[model samples]
Target: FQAEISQLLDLIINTFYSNKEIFLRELISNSSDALDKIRYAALTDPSQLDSEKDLYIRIIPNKEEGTLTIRDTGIGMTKADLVNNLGTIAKSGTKAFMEALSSGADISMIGQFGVGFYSSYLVAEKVQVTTKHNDDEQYIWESAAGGTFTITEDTEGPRLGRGTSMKLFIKEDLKEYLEEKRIREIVKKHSEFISYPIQLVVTKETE
Candidate 1:
């Protein structure tokens, strides 16, 4: 299915945030919130986490391909979740989450402002999200910040039992984001205090 973005993609891609590095921080923040959601749910029913038990975030940067992938082992999204959460700009699930908590709900997830995901477009020509939830099958979300996005199910079945992976096709001028040193420093600067572990995987070149 395809949906139109609510805001101006051009503005978001070029002028929303001051620093391009904030993209990684936002994504990691979302991941940490997702993990918190699942952990909170597990408090009521441990079975909610029957899938891959580990809860962590992984950052894999491929300089050769000029791509940076951020993966998290957390409460993944369903098709509906993707549509509601990612399909629109500035529409955050964090507000509803906080409301739920205030109303005695079982989860406490962050992300009051949803425009963070769009930060990827600052450095990526294209962004792809592959996610899997225990209650829903795996699916992919793709967008080029062209005011529209597409979502489709994964025919190969679930690759991640309970998590999400976002891959950024680094822009020509933004290839530095795909560098291990740059990303590592960014994470340390912005996401070092996150609750979950943030792991970095950098491919070494052979001479």
Candidate 2:
């Protein structure tokens, strides 16, 4: 078992990443997984898939609010899945997940293990996860790095036909991620090969 948090920190800060940009790459990778799930589901139930629109990633920045939202029109998780998938990290089964993988098992399931959602804590003070599963109601998951989180139904805003959207509350120092040019560069560099086309959403300037 990994006994020291410092040791894990060292591995993450050193071996796992050549640079911080890898976080964006990792997130986009997760987005691709979401799309892949829906695509595979399509094969079995074409009626449930949204094949009319192109599969893609959308990153939107709100500099005024110091927030960056990454939205994907892919398969979304239900509330129970969210609690199990996003809530249990760092406790119970999750620690086992990290342990079993560190021992030599395939680590690809790390995504399935659910710690990926916590990556936002590396750069944001707060995060909002909005999602709508094809067969379920729309829900929003919000939290900071604190050990607890809140999940509520979304009463407003556009409903994603089927997918997830993550809004990262950018810290003042990390405002650079909110720059349109920087966001576009990161998306193109890390996710061009993403099964879904990635688009950086921007509001049109008026007057």
Candidate 3:
């Protein structure tokens, strides 16, 4: 993106980060949007549900790897979508996004509100995204808040069938989010009432 997009992301990561726990809720909200898109698509086009009968959201936390993965079986994004209209990057092109923070009035309102996917930067040092949409092949997108992002084709095959999965490399200061209990409370507080079920994927221990 150009200067404004970068500055907008900077604001999201630095300025409004006082209330950081909302990052998880923000992500869940985006996934819910994807889930909703697929549901509506399925209503007119039944084939959208062919690969999988159910839709959901899954959060997997890896202590050893120090990463939290959120997976959703919803409408995924394409490559162009990632570059052109990803989160604030897409919305920032419009006037409201840039104006929202520049005004600096009731900024706490922006705290309750999410600036789309850019909120990932609130808690993550790096983000890895793998997604599959109905019309496009799978692709991988990665970024580390460097004001730039890279997207590569996923050659292996479709891991998600349909939807998107984001793995956030937890920052050292934000390690409390890696705890299962802490994540449970955040989800309950922010998204307990959503239509889709959100599961915390715990690794099975081998005896």
Candidate 4:
């Protein structure tokens, strides 16, 4: 999307939720689902988890890069998954997926589809999704707003081991979401019961 188009998208996203801070809530909520997947596996399969392995979510801000990254140590997506999940909107299966969730099926079913992933476009000009599933190789998915996205195999950066990390290239006007205090408030509001440990990475100066 162009600047004008992005500005319009921002307006729409900012206005869609009753509270602007709910963006953090939504993102964290998605992370919680990732954690839930692993948790479920651990219950049915004793060896699913390894010693000293952590399964928390981390939110990191990069003011210089104008980006905020939300990293999770949960179930990650593969290249085919990324392409089908992030590359197309209609194929994301949001409507039916949400219907299933609302119909009293296990909330776990909500994560089966990739609807929530699109919300990233609301505040970001571009987004990068890095993920690694336990049995699959890591992959990176990148996209600019307005419906075009690409998924490529990952070759750089620390491997997630498991789960996903999304970097939102925050639009200039949406920088407020990058503030530590602001992000904290959003977390407390939208995701206190999200079922995973959520951590925020702050700079030393802020500490």
Best by lDDT: 3
lDDT of 1 by residue, 7-122 (tens): 34435346534577877888999899899999999999999888978899999888777789999999999898887776443444334433554576543122344656766777
lDDT per model vs. reference: 0.75, 0.69, 0.77, 0.70
lDDT of 3 at 118: 63
All candidates' TM-scores? 0.82, 0.78, 0.85, 0.77
Task: Please give the range of 10 consecutive residues that has the lowest summed lDDT in model 1.
Answer: 1-10
Model 1, TM vs. native: 0.82
lDDT of 3 by residue, 1-207 (tens): 533554557565567567788778878888998899999999999999985667999999998898999999998887777666655545543355446557764544333343556677777887788998888889998766544665789987557888999899988988888888899999999897689989997667668
Mind giving the per-residue lDDT tens digits that candidate 4 earns over 55-139? Answer: 8999999898999999998877666666555335434455555566457565332234555555676677777879887777888
Error of 3 at 150 (Å): 2.6
Better of 1 and 2 by TM-score: 1
Cα displacement (angstroms), candidate 1, residue 191, comes to 1.0
Better of 3 and 4 by lDDT: 3
Q: List pairs with backbone clashes in candidate 3.
A: none
Model 3, which residues run further than 4 Å from truth?
2-8, 86-95, 105-114, 204-207
> Which of 2 and 3 is ahead in TM-score?
3
lDDT of 4 at 79: 67
Instruction: Give the poorly placed runs of model 1, Cα more than 4 Å off.
Output: 1-7, 86-111
